[PDB]
């Protein structure tokens, strides 16, 4: 035959590569105003006979998303007020309420005013977690570890979806296969213009909102024999969680300086109650039944899989931390993570503390002061998954214990970008053909 | 689960002789040397890879489930406790004797 080289351009082939994806979405911290207006009709092309070796636990999309979310948070906190004069002695009386314990302190402090040579005298209802003693003298918890800046007032913390679109010459492969664990060859692959609607929801111990699986509860771990690796559970049916702060709060403006305003909890117009989150009892029970079934799939059919509440740590990890309407909740999930499963309209109310001084993305030196939110606040969210850690030293003696997970916040992105891979097209190709010039 | 099985608790070997302590295990296996109540020191990380600063005589090979820990040109200093570890599980180590 004596075939010769023939060059084809536009060949449908690709190789694994890492690139910077750009956001497209249809005020808030995650600036979607400076993002591409997403096209109304997504282009989803089912690639038949293609099997792709996915690995969600080494996805660079997750790292890029985490870096982008942190950078957006810093960018939103930068161009507005910093609360440097607040770190002073706070004479804190107990609140008027006749009694949880001292959860609200009144805290009168001398403060700066517009004229430097003059000092005023204000007060602000702080929380117990935001003040540490130094019998009546207190100080903000962040004083000896971090520089605090005020979370910026008009800016909202409400997540809205953002799509991570790959640039030209790159493609995103979605794994449409159901019952697909994180690693291995996905046989059902599609090419998409951009990802689904991904809401950045910061949370620990419970993945709120987000996607909702397809067929069954999915347990995914980097290695199920490793305790140091967290287990991400994705539900096939959401669990409705109704959260509320019931205190009605009043926001007072204080002038700490020229053009700078500090927002304080001036008063509680109403009755001092404890914030909480309700989870349906029967729904959570059935959900945990599905979870223990899928875990017994991994660990054998004769293990007494029991769940237990989180072991100690920072407050961001021991309790289900999240943000609801601007107020940062930390919910004691000891009622959720209980019970001991064996081989065969009532609600669970979780008492949530609330914090204003926040250290995000596992950092110190950059502390944030969420302003008080006026009025009562209520949220309705979907528990669609869990982060779990398994107690080590089983010694093949069954009775595996699973406690809720930590605040890495890359595991939170891994529950959304598990099915997505980024590839680079290599259109140039050379083949043999009887073609000749 | 993790299953571990090690060689008998005491092997006697002279200077210049080669001894292999086999350890059958499922999972990433690491070899440690513990010297007379002192803290262990990582000889072998993963099945066959050498820690930095460890003597070149130390070596290992993985076939199937068994890891042999081949040591060439045994010396009086190397006589100490040796053990294999996968994750959180540690066997009671053997003890070279001379």
């Amino acid at each position, epitope marked *: 035959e004596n075939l010769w080289v023939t060059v084809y351009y536009g060949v449908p082939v690709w190789k694994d590569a890492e690139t910077t994806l750009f956001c497209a979405s249809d005020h808030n911290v995650w600036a979607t105003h400076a993002c591409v207006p997403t096209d109304p009709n997504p282009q989803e092309i089912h690639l038949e006979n293609v099997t792709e070796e996915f690995n969600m636990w080494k996805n660079n999309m997750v790292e890029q998303m985490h870096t982008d979310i942190i950078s957006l948070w810093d960018q939103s906190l930068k161009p507005c007020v910093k609360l440097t004069p607040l770190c002073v002695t706070l004479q804190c009386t107990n609140v008027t309420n006749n009694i949880m314990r001292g959860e609200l302190k009144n805290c009168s402090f001398n403060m700066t005013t517009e004229l430097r040579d003059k000092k005023q005298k204000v007060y602000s209802l702080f929380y117990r977690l935001d003040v540490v003693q130094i019998n009546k003298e207190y100080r903000l918890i962040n004083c000896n570890t971090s520089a605090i800046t005020q979370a910026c007032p008009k800016v909202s913390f409400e997540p809205i979806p953002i799509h991570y679109c790959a640039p030209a010459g790159f493609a995103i492969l979605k794994c449409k296969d159901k019952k697909f664990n994180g690693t291995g060859p996905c046989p059902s692959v599609s090419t998409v213009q951009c990802t689904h609607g991904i809401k950045p929801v910061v949370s620990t111990q419970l993945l709120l909102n987000g996607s909702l699986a397809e067929e069954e509860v999915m347990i995914r771990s980097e290695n199920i024999t490793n305790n*140091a690796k967290n287990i991400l559970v994705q539900f096939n049916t959401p669990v409705q969680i109704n959260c509320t702060r019931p205190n009605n709060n009043t926001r007072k403006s204080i002038r700490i300086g020229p053009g700078q305003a500090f927002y304080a909890t001036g008063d509680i117009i109403g009755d001092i109650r404890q914030a909480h989150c309700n989870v349906s009892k029967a729904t959570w029970n059935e959900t945990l039944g599905k979870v223990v079934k899928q875990l017994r799939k991994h660990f054998g059919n004769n293990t007494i899989i029991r769940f237990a509440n989180s072991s100690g*740590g920072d407050l961001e990890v021991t309790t289900h931390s999240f943000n609801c309407g601007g107020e940062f909740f930390y919910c004691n999930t000891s009622g959720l993570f209980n019970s001991t499963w064996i081989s065969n309209n009532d609600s669970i109310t979780l008492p949530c503390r609330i914090k204003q001084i926040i250290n995000m993305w*596992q950092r110190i030196g950059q502390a944030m002061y969420a302003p008080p939110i006026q009025g009562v606040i209520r949220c309705v969210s979907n528990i669609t998954g869990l982060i779990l850690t398994r107690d080590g030293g089983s010694t093949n003696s069954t009775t595996e214990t699973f406690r809720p997970g930590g605040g890495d916040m890359r595991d939170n992105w891994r529950s959304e970008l598990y099915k997505y891979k980024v590839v680079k097209i290599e259109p140039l190709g050379v083949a043999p053909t009887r073609c000749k010039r | 689960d993790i299953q571990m099985t090690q060689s008998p608790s005491s092997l006697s070997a002279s200077v210049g002789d080669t001894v292999t302590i086999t350890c059958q295990a499922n999972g990433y296996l690491n070899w440690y040397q513990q010297r007379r109540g002192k*803290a*262990p020191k990582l000889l072998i990380y993963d099945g066959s890879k050498l820690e930095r600063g460890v003597p070149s005589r130390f070596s290992g090979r993985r076939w199937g489930q068994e890891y042999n820990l081949t040591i060439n040109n045994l010396q009086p200093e190397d006589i100490a406790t040796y*053990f294999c570890q996968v*994750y959180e599980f*540690v066997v009671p180590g053997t003890r070279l004797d001379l």
Partner: nanobody, 121 residues
């Protein structure tokens, strides 16, 4: 360089509470889990449990659950870390040497260990 300095030997009565300390310095402490091991006299090593230095979350077996407590304190200036292990309900079995080991990688390849705090009830 990388170093994990332990505390001195402790002697406690049965039923008392003992604390062993491990000051870690010389590297990025926040990236590597700090595991605690317990060598009984003449027996093999046992796994007290690991602690994350970023979040403070410990992980201990069923045997040590309810008694052991792994805490971490990051001293200001971010110059050193101090990992503490507290045992609450000591008995005759806790006569042992406690080591603090740095888990470098997913292989659990502990390359740096502490000096070893011997406690005897």
């Amino acid at each position: 360089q990388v170093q994990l300095l332990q505390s001195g030997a402790a002697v406690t009565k049965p039923g008392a509470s003992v604390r062993v300390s491990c000051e870690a310095s010389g590297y990025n402490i926040r990236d590597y889990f700090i595991h605690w091991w317990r060598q009984a006299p003449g027996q093999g090593l046992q796994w007290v449990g690991w602690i994350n230095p970023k979040t403070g979350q410990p992980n201990n077996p069923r045997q040590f659950q309810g008694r052991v407590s792994l805490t971490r304190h990051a001293s200001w200036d971010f110059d050193t870390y101090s990992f503490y292990m507290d045992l609450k309900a000591l008995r005759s079995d806790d006569t042992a040497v406690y080591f603090c080991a740095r888990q470098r990688s997913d292989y659990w390849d502990f390359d740096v260990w502490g000096s070893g705090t011997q406690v005897t009830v």
